[PDB]
């Protein structure tokens, strides 16, 4: 057991972690900035500590401030949630230095999987398939670069090793723009992640983003909980995630899952992770791994009945895995929709006061959000304000429940992307299932 | 399926029926009174028809009005839900004769099981044990009455045959007040239900109200779906239900379920019904059967995964039961709390506008209600404004989840029994479980 | 009524040492900039300098009490 933990995050994940803590009887410390005093989890937390001013670089990315909050409150662990410092190896080792428990993998594990150039190598060593590509960082040897591009086959995509959030990616169709594309990708990587390293990979045009969720306790045990299907993306930022992935037969599911679990055992992984694969022609092609709880993880919780955050807390506390591989059973189909706060026709964030708010209810509808009537959405942080997960005995029931629950939801005073979700739900190809990662941009066409 | 149906009810059950209809692609007609034009299901329904003035006796109990509303809109079914006309055999026969499917049991079965004396006789015939009692309507032979009372053993209780809602029941300790109690209970029954028939039954002082859910398609098939322990009651009205009942081993569950399914097959039951019981010394004693979907069915839905109202709609359409008895699996534990708009101390209704409202959410928490910010709770109807169901992998997880959800619920502008529910949740004996049907009243210490 | 706010999360102290004289006290006034109180965070004793000359109107936090960011520490004038 953990006596007390610090929720070093905000918004929906902070509520999730606080609520799991309350269930497990763990005392919660909610560190916030000076503009986050109004957050629902901050008002529901046992102790609250204002760690910095509004900007993220001064409040939530401030490792010393979070450590000081943990120190003064006498906490024993720190849950980073997702975003900010969840995948920060410096945060991991700096939290572990000071005698605090980092709820997540080890610092070395985050360093290894944190740069895709090394993660791909580790996966190839472990037998997990990977997309053919540069198989190494890109240098200035332009002749070698073009030879590699010819070998793999055009088109090609340049991806930053430290890239995240869908940025720092450029698609190159020919040698004409290769150098300029590489230069601009390096510049963006320098300006964003402080790492100009880039690598080139084959650009599959009809894949399906299928990711595996795995729980490992760091003691030689690891399990895999079904998968997901995040193929409904815009600008490489997911919009609708669902599990289990349609069309993935139990044979293929087990084949990929057991290999993922073996790979987890290979690197001595700990906590909850996620392997991201591209599905095409029945072959999986690893692209990256997320060493943290994923935003869309609630879909995996509603089909297996396994609370992932409580599993993370138990694993951090030292207890081994209490779930056997045979005990995991997929019963149903869940569909999630991220409700952002932005102009639906311009995808620009829209901060402002929420005058009316009414969350939907019903049998199998989960609403995961921190907003409430009279909550002023701040402009400093990301635009996501909630998630809506609907569950049913089959995909059609889940989609119908989603369509019902999207109409019953009211959010006034700010420009939110609920109508986009409603029109995505009504799309016929989506109802068919198995659409590709580029389908949504084609549907919008602009 | 049914082309269109009429929801001859109001409040939470109306939303439950509307949502089940929407998921199934069924059009909905929402009949309402003149004071219920702001109900959520009325504003979400496909069609709306006003059937009468504010009082229930003129609008929601006006069988001709509901039949007319079904006729003009071209409906093909009428779903009564619970209360009002759900257990009105006259309504069933009139609806079926007019040419509309009645979503529920047959008129003959409603007549048979509604009369508690005939229900007890049929249960004894079919092999269902019953509480020792008069075994027939009370006569004028006071000598025989007192002889039977002495034989079974005092105390005894006089219950109206057509009684409901916990009214028209009187407990007798000895022969002194038997005649006067019987006469006054008969007068009360005349005043309330227009039926003075009464019967006498043995009074068990430490029972546990256990009820079984049975689904039967009326074609010779019937199944049972776990049970529910509605022990926590005040004034003979349930406050907290849960499912499955603690301490009822699977052997007893299968035993009573097989007996109840056989009884349903024998008496040609159709639809969804509930067999109430009293549990003591490992033996059940039938008391009454509810020929309608019950207020606390969501717990059964959440533990078994079977949508009961959708099953009702499918059975009414004639489809045979697609769920076998072996395919019904109980997985977890659900606890439900009824939220009423009343004084937590004086237990009197508190109608009024709701100035603010923020419903609870999270993992494994269902909020089934019809209120919103600005809703004006009318004084003409029952005081229930919603139900709150929480599900977990065991009783303790579900109760902790319930505590969090109750702490998270806001209802202002009226007086609501939320603090009482929190108190019940915090009771140590309730957390241990197995409390008797009289525990809550004794908890008040009066 | 100027209010001096703590610039970091830590524990508030008046004496630079456990058994030393307090830096300031209500009444006795201060200058534009000088040590006024201590906020300890991860060791590394930190000194809070006033940003305004004035008299110490009052002090709002006792010694040993953890303080947060933008915690009112003292009131000057």
């Amino acid at each position: 057991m953990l006596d007390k933990i610090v929720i070093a995050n905000r918004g929906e994940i902070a509520l999730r972690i606080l609520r799991a803590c309350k269930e497990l009887g763990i005392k919660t410390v909610a560190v916030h900035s000076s503009a986050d005093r109004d957050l629902k989890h901050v008002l529901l937390a046992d102790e609250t500590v204002c760690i910095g001013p509004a900007p993220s670089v001064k409040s939530y990315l401030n490792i010393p401030a979070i450590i000081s909050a943990a120190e003064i409150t006498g906490a024993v662990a720190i849950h980073p949630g997702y975003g900010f410092l969840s995948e920060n190896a410096n945060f991991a080792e700096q939290v572990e230095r000071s005698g605090f428990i980092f709820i997540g993998p080890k610092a070395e594990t985050i360093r290894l999987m944190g740069d895709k150039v090394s993660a791909i190598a580790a996966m190839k060593k472990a037998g997990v398939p990977c997309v053919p590509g540069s198989d190494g960082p890109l240098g200035d040897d332009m002749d070698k670069n073009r030879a590699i591009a010819k070998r793999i086959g055009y088109p090609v995509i340049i991806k930053a090793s430290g890239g995240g959030g869908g940025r720092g990616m450029r698609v190159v169709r020919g040698d004409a723009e290769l150098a300029q594309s590489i230069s601009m990708t390096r510049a963006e990587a320098k300006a964003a992640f402080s790492n100009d390293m880039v690598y080139m990979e084959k650009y599959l045009e009809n894949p399906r983003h299928v990711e595996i969720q795995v729980l490992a306790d760091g003691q030689g045990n690891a399990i895999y909980l079904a998968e997901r299907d995040c193929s409904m993306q815009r600008r490489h930022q997911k919009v609708v995630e669902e599990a289990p992935a349609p069309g993935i037969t139990p044979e293929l599911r087990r084949y990929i899952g057991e290999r993922c679990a073996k790979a987890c055992v290979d690197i001595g992984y700990r906590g909850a992770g996620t392997f991201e694969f591209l599905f095409e022609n029945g072959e999986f092609y690893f692209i990256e791994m997320n060493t943290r709880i994923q935003v869309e993880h609630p879909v995996t919780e509603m089909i297996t009945g396994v609370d992932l955050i409580k599993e993370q807390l138990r694993i951090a506390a030292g207890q081994p895995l209490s779930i056997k591989q045979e005990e995991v059973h997929v019963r149903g189909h869940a569909v999630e929709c991220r409700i952002n706060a932005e102009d639906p026709n311009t995808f620009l964030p829209s901060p402002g006061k929420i005058t009316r708010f009414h969350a939907p209810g019903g049998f199998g509808v989960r609403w995961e959000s921190h907003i409430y009537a009279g909550y002023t959405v701040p402009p400093y942080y990301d635009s996501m304000i909630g998630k809506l997960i609907c569950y049913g005995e089959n995909r059609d029931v889940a989609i119908a429940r989603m369509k019902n629950a999207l109409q019953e939801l009211i959010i006034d005073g700010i420009k939110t992307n609920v109508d986009l979700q409603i029109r995505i739900m009504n799309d016929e190809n989506f109802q068919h299932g198995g659409t590709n990662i580029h389908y949504l941009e084609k549907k919008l066409g602009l | 399926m049914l082309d269109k149906i009429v929801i001859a009810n109001r409040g939470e059950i109306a939303l439950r029926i509307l949502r089940a209809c929407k998921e199934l692609g069924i059009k909905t007609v929402a009949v309402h009174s003149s004071a219920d034009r702001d109900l959520k299901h009325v504003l979400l329904a496909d069609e709306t028809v006003c059937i009468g003035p504010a009082p229930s006796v003129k609008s929601y109990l006006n069988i001709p009005a509901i039949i007319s509303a079904a006729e003009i809109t071209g409906a093909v079914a009428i779903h009564p839900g619970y209360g009002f006309l759900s257990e009105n055999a006259n309504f069933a026969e009139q609806v079926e004769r007019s040419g509309f499917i009645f979503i529920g049991p047959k008129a003959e079965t409603i007549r048979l099981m509604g009369d508690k004396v005939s229900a007890i006789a049929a249960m004894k015939k079919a092999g269902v044990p019953c509480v020792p009692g008069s075994d027939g309507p009370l006569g004028d032979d006071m000598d025989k009455n007192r002889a039977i009372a002495k034989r079974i053993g005092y105390p005894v209780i006089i219950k109206a045959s057509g009684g409901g809602g916990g009214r028209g029941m009187r407990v007798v300790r000895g022969d002194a007040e038997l005649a006067q109690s019987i006469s006054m209970t008969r007068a009360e029954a005349k005043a309330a239900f227009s039926n003075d028939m009464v019967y006498m039954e043995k009074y068990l002082e430490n029972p546990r109200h256990v009820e079984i859910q049975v689904l039967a398609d009326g074609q010779g098939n019937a199944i049972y779906l776990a049970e529910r322990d509605c022990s926590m009651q005040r004034r003979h009205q349930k406050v907290v239900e849960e499912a499955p009942a603690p301490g009822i081993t699977p052997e007893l569950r299968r035993y009573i379920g097989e007996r109840c399914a056989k009884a349903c097959v024998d008496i040609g039951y159709r639809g969804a019904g509930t067999f109430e019981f009293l549990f003591e010394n490992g033996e059940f004693y039938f008391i009454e059967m509810n020929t309608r979907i019950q207020v606390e069915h969501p717990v059964t839905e959440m533990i078994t995964g079977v949508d009961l109202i959708k099953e009702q709609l499918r059975i009414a359409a004639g489809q045979p039961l697609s769920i076998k008895q072996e395919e019904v699996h109980v997985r977890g534990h659900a606890v439900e709390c009824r939220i009423n708009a009343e004084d937590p101390n004086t237990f009197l209704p508190s109608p009024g506008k709701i100035t603010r409202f923020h419903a609870p959410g999270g993992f494994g928490v269902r909020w089934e209600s019809h209120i919103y910010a600005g809703y004006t709770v009318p004084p003409y109807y029952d005081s229930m404004i919603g139900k709150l169901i929480c599900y977990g992998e065991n009783r303790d997880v579900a109760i902790a989840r319930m505590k969090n959800a109750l702490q998270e619920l806001i209802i202002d502008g009226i007086k609501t029994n939320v603090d009482l529910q929190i108190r019940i949740m915090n009771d140590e004996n309730f957390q241990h479980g197995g409390t008797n049907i009289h525990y809550l009243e004794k908890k008040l210490g009066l | 009524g100027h209010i001096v706010r703590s610039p970091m999360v830590g524990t508030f102290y008046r004496t630079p040492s456990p058994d030393a004289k307090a830096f300031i006290e209500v009444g006795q006034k201060v200058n534009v900039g000088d040590t006024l109180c201590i906020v300890e965070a991860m060791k590394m004793m930190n000194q809070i300098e006033a940003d305004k000359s004035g008299t110490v109107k009052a002090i709002l936090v006792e010694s040993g009490q953890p303080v947060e960011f933008d915690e009112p520490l003292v009131v000057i004038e």
Binding site: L43, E71, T73, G74, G374 | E408 | Q65, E68
Partner: peptide
């Protein structure tokens, strides 16, 4: 009504030890 919370203060008695180096 968790929206209006008292904004209580932290209990100083809680102590955590960080290595000096």
């Amino acid at each position: 009504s968790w929206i209006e919370r008292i904004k209580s203060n932290i209990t100083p008695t809680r102590k955590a030890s960080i290595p000096e180096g």
